[PDB]
Amino acid sequence: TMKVINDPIHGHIELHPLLVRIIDTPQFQRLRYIKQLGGGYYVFPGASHNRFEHSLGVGYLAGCLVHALGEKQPELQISERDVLCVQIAGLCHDLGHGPFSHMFDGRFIPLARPEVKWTHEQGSVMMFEHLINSNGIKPVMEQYGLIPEEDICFIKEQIVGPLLWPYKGRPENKSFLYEIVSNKRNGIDVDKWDYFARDCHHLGIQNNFDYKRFIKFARVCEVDNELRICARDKEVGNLYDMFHTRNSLHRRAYQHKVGNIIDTMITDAFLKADDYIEITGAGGKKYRISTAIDDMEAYTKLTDNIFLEILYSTDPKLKDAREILKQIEYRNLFKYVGETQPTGQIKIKREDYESLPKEVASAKPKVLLDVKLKAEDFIVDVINMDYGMQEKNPIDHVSFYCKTAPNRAIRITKNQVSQLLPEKFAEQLIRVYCKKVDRKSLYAARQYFVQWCADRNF
Amino acid sequence: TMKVINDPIHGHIELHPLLVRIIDTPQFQRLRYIKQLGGGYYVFPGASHNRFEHSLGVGYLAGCLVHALGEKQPELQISERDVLCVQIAGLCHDLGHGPFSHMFDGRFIPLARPEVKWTHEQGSVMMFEHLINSNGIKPVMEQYGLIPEEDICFIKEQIVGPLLWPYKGRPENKSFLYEIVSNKRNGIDVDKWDYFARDCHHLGIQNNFDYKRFIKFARVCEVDNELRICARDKEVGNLYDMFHTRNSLHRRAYQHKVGNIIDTMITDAFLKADDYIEITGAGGKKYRISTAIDDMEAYTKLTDNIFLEILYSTDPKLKDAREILKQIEYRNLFKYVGETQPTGQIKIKREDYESLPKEVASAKPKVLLDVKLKAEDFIVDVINMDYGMQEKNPIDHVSFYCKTAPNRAIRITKNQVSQLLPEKFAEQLIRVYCKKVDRKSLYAARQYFVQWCADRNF
Amino acid sequence: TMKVINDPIHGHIELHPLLVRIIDTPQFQRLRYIKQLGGGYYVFPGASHNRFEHSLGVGYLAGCLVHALGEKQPELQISERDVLCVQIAGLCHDLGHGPFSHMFDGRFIPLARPEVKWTHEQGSVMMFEHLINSNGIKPVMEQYGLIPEEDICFIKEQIVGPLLWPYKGRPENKSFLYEIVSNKRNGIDVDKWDYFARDCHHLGIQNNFDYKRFIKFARVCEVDNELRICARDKEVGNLYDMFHTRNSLHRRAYQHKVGNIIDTMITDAFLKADDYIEITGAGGKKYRISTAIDDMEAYTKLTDNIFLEILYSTDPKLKDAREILKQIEYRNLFKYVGETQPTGQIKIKREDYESLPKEVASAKPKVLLDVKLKAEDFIVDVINMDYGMQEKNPIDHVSFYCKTAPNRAIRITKNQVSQLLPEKFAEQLIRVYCKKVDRKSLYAARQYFVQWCADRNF
Amino acid sequence: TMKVINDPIHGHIELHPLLVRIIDTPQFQRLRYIKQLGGGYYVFPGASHNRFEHSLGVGYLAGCLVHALGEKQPELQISERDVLCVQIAGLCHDLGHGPFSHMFDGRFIPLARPEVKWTHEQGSVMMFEHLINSNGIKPVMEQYGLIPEEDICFIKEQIVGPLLWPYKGRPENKSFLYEIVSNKRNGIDVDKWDYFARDCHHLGIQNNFDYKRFIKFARVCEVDNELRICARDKEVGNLYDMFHTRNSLHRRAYQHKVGNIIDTMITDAFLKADDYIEITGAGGKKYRISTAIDDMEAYTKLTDNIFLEILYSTDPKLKDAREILKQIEYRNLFKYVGETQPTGQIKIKREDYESLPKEVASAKPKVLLDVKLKAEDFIVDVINMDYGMQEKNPIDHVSFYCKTAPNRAIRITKNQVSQLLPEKFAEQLIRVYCKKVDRKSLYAARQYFVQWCADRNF
Ligand SMILES: Nc1nc2c(ncn2[C@@H]2O[C@H](COP(=O)(O)OP(=O)(O)OP(=O)(O)O)[C@@H](O)[C@H]2O)c(=O)[nH]1
Ligand SMILES: Nc1nc2c(ncn2[C@@H]2O[C@H](COP(=O)(O)OP(=O)(O)OP(=O)(O)O)[C@@H](O)[C@H]2O)c(=O)[nH]1
Ligand SMILES: Nc1nc2c(ncn2[C@@H]2O[C@H](COP(=O)(O)OP(=O)(O)OP(=O)(O)O)[C@@H](O)[C@H]2O)c(=O)[nH]1
Ligand SMILES: Nc1nc2c(ncn2[C@@H]2O[C@H](COP(=O)(O)OP(=O)(O)OP(=O)(O)O)[C@@H](O)[C@H]2O)c(=O)[nH]1
Ligand SMILES: Nc1ncnc2c1ncn2[C@H]1C[C@H](O)[C@@H](COP(=O)(O)OP(=O)(O)OP(=O)(O)O)O1
Ligand SMILES: Nc1ncnc2c1ncn2[C@H]1C[C@H](O)[C@@H](COP(=O)(O)OP(=O)(O)OP(=O)(O)O)O1
Ligand SMILES: Nc1ccn([C@H]2C[C@H](O)[C@@H](COP(=O)(O)OP(=O)(O)OP(=O)(O)O)O2)c(=O)n1
């Protein structure tokens, strides 16, 4: 029967029985042990939430948006099958996160296995197939009027994108159903609204966006030659404010210096613990931490528990990882030497990060200081802040309609809106750290840094 | 004794007995009948608050800031006399608003009496003198250790400014006390924090600024041979976000189209009712609505009650004002024809607003439309949005200090901060309204407007 | 077309065009100038709200409850005509309040005109007819599918009750529609939920009831022989907590001593100003403040403006009322002598309040004190606190259903629930004041009170 | 130097450097991995917080209360040494919690080791001693003006109580310092305020108590012959409301049926996993889960990680514990048969819970049903709800003072307050569960229960 669950952000959420069936599996319950912000919990003590309630909220908001669209415009022909499919896609959009969320697929996997390209959405697709095939959900889907052959492909396409009309789950007269959970065109979707609200509730920061007002004024118009979701022409300021809010959140919380350095130390400890911790998969077959993304049964057992397993270990071979984690526990962190002024002109590419410590080390300080450092004594971290679409104005890809003619989409240029808006939509900065605590090493490193920054006009 | 009052924004506020004595007078209790937002109550039904609680909050916040400064730096030598003076100045800073707050001294007085310059701060000073002299507060001030001949001048200077060191209330080693209640240099003071919080609580909009964090990191440094209040060097993003929040508040609430047109109609009704209403002042002498700012006893009786006095009147001579107010009550409003694109290059000055309707009327619509309008059928409203300091970057006038050297003040340039900040700090737009609203005077008026906006490159 | 309004309590509210038509009338806009809590604004400075937004909220909540009931049980056959009628009844349920809300019909009218029985619900019915007949809403109702002959009677019966099945607006198979806006059986309705939320938002007190959870578990069952709204059998603790919250609100805010004494003084001033202020009605016919409840046109002009009209008056004959109001403005209040212990055994009726002062005055204090007071120097106020149904357990009149059998209603006895619940549901206490401020009069009155409270076992 | 932490409940908290030193130890950082509500996270998905932030909040509130007391009464002679000692005692009051907080010392230890009497406060004392002696904090305490010989005893006495005047940390003229963190007389202390606010913030339930108002009106008086903390005589209703709030919280969240049954299953799994898991302590000696409370080094490594260590295990001997945990993960829980009506007359003692299943099983249902159950097929849970002092009115042990004479403490009886207060302060109920999911076993168990509940007048 129908079930109810109490959320501190959205209130009482109502769950269809098929969703209840999907939620009560080990593959979904694994998310109770993966934290939303990873290493930000060691700076903001209120951020102890996990991916489980975030996924519930995303599913609920997707259902709400589809219901509002269907009520407002009966000619779109939204059925309940589509509502269930969209809700399921919103529920399982993040099944593929690893320990400490973004740490795993942002810092560890690239360093541990540089020859593969892996993102947590591909893992989400893999884990969704594993869940469905392992927990016998196929007849249950058949029981409520779904056609699995089509609906599973539709859900997969909603989660990861196409696997002229490139999609296969739904025909070209249902294009607006692909913008609800994940919007790869302009980046407006219920996922952002959810984590905005939740991280602002937990971190203790105040929020700006009102997504209920946005849902009130949302409509489906025939843009170009395919149906899309359009906003009222007077919501442009609110859209710009939403993107400003996202930028402020990133700057204040998700790119904190100490949180990033703690993530760096955790990644280093996990790199040292690799080749010594073991995970068992399908058929009594053994796997590594880095190679566990090849077998889903072994991946099902990879959570934040590895941190405490390493910390409380006694094996002689995990000594160095234990040392790094104990260093974290005493608050003996790598220190901060200095940052670089933001600049959108000169760009450091993804293949060039492995040389920056060498550049910093191989400088010639003008003053005479004895203590000299090596290239292994520096960590360089580079932060990219934009509006989500690689220095393109995302509002340029949004359609609007006027009250007089609600069935006609139009475009709004930035100059028409205001003159106090930002002029560019991306930048980059560089941070330098030192792994020596001596009161003289922090002076030598700063002298080294003021000679490498004032060398290339950074 | 000591008294307590419960505030929905700040909680329980504690009041010194002298403040209690000052609050219990007719001149101060007059603020219970003046609304904070004037005509915004007819768009946002939650904004029914008055100036009384706003003044209480401003006084409380000024006390808190002074207390924190004194606690953190014992060498500044803040006495309790200074705390009481600052609290009193914060309490009585808005004694001078007339009916509907900003409408009175923004729209009515300039139109009713163009030969005088009057602001509500001068009225606040006049009313403060009237209150003190009329309610016998001089011995009471003497009773608690104040020296009225000095402290009254100090309070007046805090409220309105100077009446090289130009001030007289305090010597040059107490300069930081003149920017707590009103900051005429960079515009950072507890008044903004208070009305931010209160308007966001009542209107139903969400807030961003954390003034408690700002108070935590505030310090007094010697900036260029003069003591000032300095922020920590890492609060620059928060300051920029605060100014963005102020701009968003103005745009969303304080310059709403319908609220502005309602204010226009109220001002018109008040202009028509002038020369027919009587206010009695000192000595039994009579006064107008416009000339009541010359006698404080007559001004003490000028509140929002004039609206209902005109609406419920029966005298034959107030018929036109009654008609306009009844028009408001049925929601028969002047309609909106069109706005002008923002531009910070070409500026319309204060003396040029009386000719714009003539320009709009005297156009040559290319298309053939019969209905022709006159210069009395148009209302033109001009809106100036900036960062509070006439297109000067207010952050350029803020001092910062570093953690390593907290006694040295420095400057921070915009480029050092980020690249996504705004490039200019002011703009201007023009709104045109129609006063016929029938069926086709709007089509004709829209043609007139499109043929007038293309005649000057607007 | 459809309109939207932003509420700080419920968010964005959506209004049917007929409701918009009804709202834009003088009779409805009169509520913008009547305060919700009357004299509580002079103790709690945050309570400045009026009846306008409360009526909007009540209408919105009634619509929500009807919509949920219709969605959950398609067999009840709720039409959109019923939804509109219920929303209209919820919108206009308080059209009949006078100045300062409950003061007018609780203290003033009984004292001014003791020979009539008048409540603000009868006034609401009268004003609803005045509005409908005066603003030409009958064809507009006919335009949207309503049948005025039936629907107006239905709305009246919802507002005031019957004018075995005693009702006429709807047949006996629609009984559950008569307990949505006003519940005369157990006192559970959206009006309480609305004013709970609004007064807790404004006063700065915390709320506990969750009406959304209640709406989730609400159902319609056949209890005796007629349809009724039933709660889930596990919501009994929440119902008891709701009644505890209502009692706490009354005690903490609505029966504050200073607020009640301020209301007493306002009533006395209005009694003295009667026979000197005049109101014009239909046909150029003159009326008093007390006799204005006989002509709705004259009543339309009776708001809180009379307070400021008396305060700012100059006529010689209103001198005493002016004196009392000026006394309020300086905070020279009647003083508090003492209360009586609550007692639910000996009851004072409404006919003995006029004689209680004589009983208090005609006592003989044992000890010797020279200062002797009269019967005109005392005010006695009698406060009744119950659970809304005259010492009857309101939960005894609620039906519940079990999850296993949702179509059968049952009863739940108090002993089955808990042992920490209250044993009786009503009580009464008595307060005594003094209109003398002398430091000796407050001692003489206290002796008189201790010699009168020990004379009847109080 | 001074450090700041951002709390979602209290805002920005300042920490003295010695507190920062104490916080950065493994023994204190262990609390990041122990959940506040244990098994309530599987019913309320928002309750994912740990003991770390709760301890921070308790320390902050204790500091605030001491500061206010010292500020409004300079004659008490509170020094900064006392403030630091009280803050430290408030910080470390819960160092001794085991996995899943109250489950460990409420259900597991009594069943695992009935021969010992162990509470988490004794563990807190032991762990505080271990922390101080192991992390070299003694010279650091000496550095800031503390005398360890006296101050450590004072802190220990604050945490656990005495180890006429029975105390040793402070003399009899500082008695009011022993009821700030833990109040063993009437149960009013900052710990309750903290967990009230935090659990209401996370669970999604609303709160009633205002501790800031309580702090405003708090004072120190000499009640019998020792200094105590007294409330203003008009805060009695607020105190009663606070205890009602605590009761409501317990009923609604802390004694949820499904949460309690999940705790039962976790305890059973941990009992089966005992004698198979090992923990290493001081000297390389090995310990069990139940015997780890004898060595603090081994206890430092006992957190919620054991749950996931058992769940992800592969050893053959942990099969049954793995089965129970996997059962939890699929939501195949023990079922609820029925409860018993509350009755505070015949109490079931602590030693009598081991035979209740036998009593339930050894009944003779009147009607005929074939399926027969055993005494091992039933779990009986007994719940005690009171006001924290074993059916004694806690308000009877509170002192109050009047405004006229603030230095005299008085008593207030319940009859003087109101008649709607509860008459008894304790009760007891019994819940029965079945471990046989079926369609006939759940009927047989109910038939057995309605014959055992009617055999003793329950
Ligand atoms: N099924 C399920 N419920 C959850 C979960 N997390 C929180 N809950 C809530 O916890 C409550 C406990 O109910 P159930 O787990 O279904 O136990 P029950 O209600 O006794 O079992 P039923 O006979 O199915 O009603 C539910 O109403 C949910 O709202 C979860 O992960 N799975
Ligand atoms: N004096 C005063 N109090 C106000 C005002 N507005 C709200 N209040 C609050 O209302 C409460 C009522 O108290 P008082 O007006 O002083 O009446 P009282 O307490 O019986 O008189 P006292 O003998 O002075 O204590 C106060 O505690 C204030 O916190 C105001 O404008 N003036
Ligand atoms: N009609 C009306 N709107 C109100 C009232 N109070 C607040 N509002 C809000 O104020 C907003 C102003 O809109 P309108 O008064 O209709 O003015 P308008 O939108 O320019 O006129 P339209 O052409 O009808 O759209 C509305 O959207 C309402 O949500 C009220 O009392 N009456
Ligand atoms: N020390 C410490 N800080 C914490 C902890 N949890 C959250 N924080 C916050 O995280 C912030 C990070 O600061 P630090 O850990 O001291 O790092 P840092 O500021 O670069 O080092 P310092 O040179 O001492 O200033 C602090 O300001 C704290 O407010 C904790 O457990 N220990
Ligand atoms: N229970 C309450 N919760 C919150 N605010 C309250 C409560 N009771 C009163 N207030 C408000 C009323 C005023 O705004 C402010 C203080 O008033 P209050 O405590 O009633 O003082 P008072 O002047 O009536 O009493 P007294 O002079 O006897 O101390 O707090
Ligand atoms: N940005 C905003 N955020 C929150 N509430 C807002 C905002 N802008 C307006 N409101 C309020 C004002 C009204 O109370 C309600 C709807 O008003 P609004 O959207 O401005 O309609 P309108 O009548 O001015 O426009 P139109 O007729 O062109 O649709 O919402
Ligand atoms: N550098 C980053 C990136 C994000 N986050 C956290 C903050 C958000 O709460 C969450 C974002 O959730 P997702 O894993 O779904 O990332 P998305 O790709 O969906 O984010 P976006 O909306 O930008 O696409 O991750 C973080 O800690 N640090």
**Amino acid at position C79, single letter:** S
The reply to whether ligand 6 has any atom less than 6 angstroms from the CB of B43 is yes
Distance C451 CA to ligand 1 centre (A): 63
**Residue D204 vs residues A11, A210, D165: alpha-carbon distances, Å:** 8, 20, 44
Residue reference for tokens 């409940």: D9
Instruction: Pick C341's closest partner by Cβ from D247, D251, D416.
Output: D416
Torsion angle defined by CA atoms of residues B412, B415, B420 and B425, in that order, rounded to the nearest 10 degrees: 70
Residue-by-residue DSSP string for D21-37: HHHSSHHHHGGGGSBSS
Q: What is the DSSP code (8-state) at residue D14? A: E
Q: What is the DSSP code (8-state) at residue B389? A: S
Same domain assignment for residues D205 and D157: yes
D268 annotated as belonging to a binding site for a ligand: no
Token code pair at residue A376: 């292994």
Minimal-distance CA residue to ligand 4 atom 29: D5
Cβ distance of B4 and D216 shorter than 8 Å: yes
The catalytic site residues of A sit at: 120
Rg (CA), chain B: 24
Cβ distance of A212 and C11 shorter than 8 Å: yes
Q: Do the domain assignments include residue B394?
A: no
Q: What is the DSSP code (8-state) at residue A229? A: E
In whole angstroms, give the CA distance from residue A399 to residue A222: 10
Instruction: Residue C406: name the closest of C227, C219, C223 by CA.
Output: C219
Cβ distance of C4 and A212 shorter than 8 Å: no
Minimal-distance CA residue to ligand 5 atom 10: B6
> Which residues have CB under 6 Å of ligand 7?
A 36-38, 94, 101-102, 191-192, 195, 199, 254, 388
Q: Do the domain assignments include residue C456?
A: yes
Distance A242 CA to ligand 3 centre (A): 25
User: How many helices (H) does chain D have, and how many strands (E)?
Assistant: 19, 11
Same domain assignment for residues D135 and D63: yes
Nearest residue of A to residue C10 by CA position?
A: A212
Resolution of this entry in Å?
A: 2.7
Q: Which domain holds residue A159?
A: 3-237
Residues in chain B: 458
Active-site entry in D16, D49, D120, D202: D120
Residue reference for tokens 């993966």: A34
Q: Which ligand is in closest contact with the Cα of A94?
A: 7
Q: What is the DSSP code (8-state) at residue B250? A: I
Nearest residue of D to residue A28 by CA position?
A: D329
Q: Is the dihedral of CA B61, B64, B69, B72 positive or negative?
A: negative
Which region, left, alpha or beta, applies to residue A224 given φ > 0 means left and ψ of -120 to 50 means alpha? left
* Angle formed by the axes of helices B80-91 and B51-72, nearest 10°: 160
Q: Is D207 helix (H, G, I), strand (E, B) or coil?
A: coil
Nearest residue of A to residue B209 by CA position?
A: A206
CB-CB contact of B263 with B103 (8 Å):
yes
Q: Is A319 exposed, middle or buried (0-12, 13-18, 19+ CB in 10 A)?
A: exposed
Domain final residue pick, A293, A312, A333:
A333
Strand partners, B386: B426
In whole angstroms, give the CA distance from residue A195 to residue D39: 25
Q: Is D226 helix (H, G, I), strand (E, B) or coil?
A: coil
Same domain assignment for residues D27 and D171: yes
Same domain assignment for residues A215 and A316: no
Same domain assignment for residues D266 and D165: no
Q: Do the domain assignments include residue B401?
A: no
Q: Do the domain assignments include residue B346?
A: no
Q: Is the dihedral of CA D328, D331, D337, D340 positive or negative?
A: positive
A43-65 residues labelled b (16+ CB within 10 A) or e (exposed): bbbbbbbbbbbbbbbbbbbbbbb
Nearest ligand 1 atom to the CA of D333 is 17
Q: Residues of A forming the annotated binding site?
A: 3-4, 6, 24, 29, 32, 36-37, 43, 51, 54, 93-94, 97, 102, 191-192, 195, 199, 213, 232, 234, 238, 246, 252, 254-257, 331, 335, 403
**Residues contacting B115, CB < 8 A, separation 6+:** none
User: How many helices (H) does chain A have, and how many strands (E)?
Assistant: 19, 11
Q: Residues of A forming the annotated binding site for dTTP?
A: 6, 36, 43, 51, 97, 102, 192, 195, 199, 213, 232, 234, 255-257, 403
Cβ distance of C11 and A216 shorter than 8 Å: no
Instruction: Residue B228: name the closest of B307, B145, B172, B309 by CA.
Output: B172
In whole angstroms, give the CA distance from residue B158 to residue B220: 18
> Which residues have CB under 6 Å of ligand 4?
A 42-43, 45, 258, 331; D 3-5, 20, 23-24
Same domain assignment for residues A328 and A208: no
**Amino acid at position C269, single letter:** A
The reply to whether ligand 6 has any atom less than 6 angstroms from the CB of C1 is no
Cβ distance of D212 and B4 shorter than 8 Å: no
Token code pair at residue B346: 């070409």
The catalytic site residues of B sit at: 120
For residue A9, the chain D residues in CB contact (below 8 A) are 46
Token code pair at residue B158: 């805090």
Nearest residue of A to residue C404 by CA position?
A: A1
In whole angstroms, give the CA distance from residue A52 to residue A38: 14
* Angle formed by the axes of helices D80-91 and D51-72, nearest 10°: 160
According to the entry, how was the structure determined?
A: cryo-EM
Instruction: Pick A24's closest partner by Cβ from D46, D308, D331.
Output: D331
Domain count along chain A: 2
Same domain assignment for residues A11 and A134: yes
For residue B248, the chain A residues in CB contact (below 8 A) are 237, 241
How many CB pairs lie under 8 A apart between chains A and B? 53
Which helix (H) or strand (E) segment holds residue D427: the answer is strand D426-434
Q: Do the domain assignments include residue C403?
A: yes
Taking every pair of Cα atoms in chain A, the longest distance, rounded to a whole number of angstroms, is 79
Same domain assignment for residues D19 and D155: yes
For residue C46, the chain B residues in CB contact (below 8 A) are 6-9, 49, 53
Instruction: Residue A306: name the closest of D302, D308, D277 by CA.
Output: D308
Cβ distance of B48 and C44 shorter than 8 Å: no
Which helix (H) or strand (E) segment holds residue D382: the answer is strand D378-386
D331 annotated as belonging to a binding site for a ligand: yes
CB-CB contact of B409 with B400 (8 Å):
yes
Q: Do the domain assignments include residue A458?
A: no
Instruction: Residue C293: name the closest of C52, C98, C92 by CA.
Output: C98
- Give, rounded to a whole angstrom, the gap between the first and last alpha carbons of chain C: 62
Q: Do the domain assignments include residue D74?
A: yes
In whole angstroms, give the CA distance from residue D286 to residue D271: 18
In whole angstroms, give the CA distance from residue D86 to residue D70: 13
User: HSE of C453 in the Cβ direction (CA atoms, 13 Å)?
Assistant: 19
Instruction: Residue C199: name the closest of C59, C341, C50, C61 by CA.
Output: C50
In whole angstroms, give the CA distance from residue A289 to residue A274: 6
Q: How far is D350 from chain A (nearest CA, A)?
A: 34
Instruction: Residue B124: name the closest of B181, B187, B84, B193 by CA.
Output: B181
Which residues sit directly before a break in chain C (C to N > 2.5 Å)?
163
Instruction: Pick D11's closest partner by Cβ from B12, B14, B212.
Output: B212
- Give, rounded to a whole angstrom, the gap between the first and last alpha carbons of chain B: 63
Instruction: Residue A445: name the closest of A387, A368, A365 by CA.
Output: A365
Domain final residue pick, D333, D356, D391:
D333
Domain final residue pick, B285, B305, B333:
B333
Cβ distance of C420 and D418 shorter than 8 Å: no
- CATH number, domain of B109, equals 1.10.3210.10
Q: What is the DSSP code (8-state) at residue B363? A: -
Token code pair at residue C41: 């604004």
Same domain assignment for residues C72 and C219: yes
B364-403 residues labelled b (16+ CB within 10 A) or e (exposed): eeeeeeeeebeeebbbbbbbebbbbbeeebbbeebbbbee
Same domain assignment for residues D211 and D127: yes
Chains in touch with D (3+ beta-carbon pairs under 8 Å) read A, B, C
Same domain assignment for residues B311 and B266: yes
Q: Is C298 exposed, middle or buried (0-12, 13-18, 19+ CB in 10 A)?
A: buried
Q: How far is A141 from chain B (nearest CA, A)?
A: 42
Distance B76 CA to ligand 4 centre (A): 30
Token code pair at residue B38: 């004037």
In whole angstroms, give the CA distance from residue D78 to residue D75: 8
Q: Is the dihedral of CA B293, B299, B304, B310 positive or negative?
A: negative
Q: Do the domain assignments include residue D449?
A: no
Mutate to test the interface with A, among B419, B424, B428, B446 (most CBs of A within 10 A): B419
The reply to whether ligand 2 has any atom less than 6 angstroms from the CB of C258 is yes
The reply to whether ligand 5 has any atom less than 6 angstroms from the CB of C251 is no
User: HSE of C191 in the Cβ direction (CA atoms, 13 Å)?
Assistant: 19
In whole angstroms, give the CA distance from residue D315 to residue D299: 23
Distance A445 CA to ligand 2 centre (A): 63
Residue-by-residue DSSP string for B148-166: HHHHHHHHHHHHH------
Same domain assignment for residues C392 and C456: no
In whole angstroms, give the CA distance from residue D26 to residue D19: 14
Residue-by-residue DSSP string for A148-198: HHHHHHHHHHHHH--------SS-GGGGGGGSSS--SSS--SHHHHHHHHH
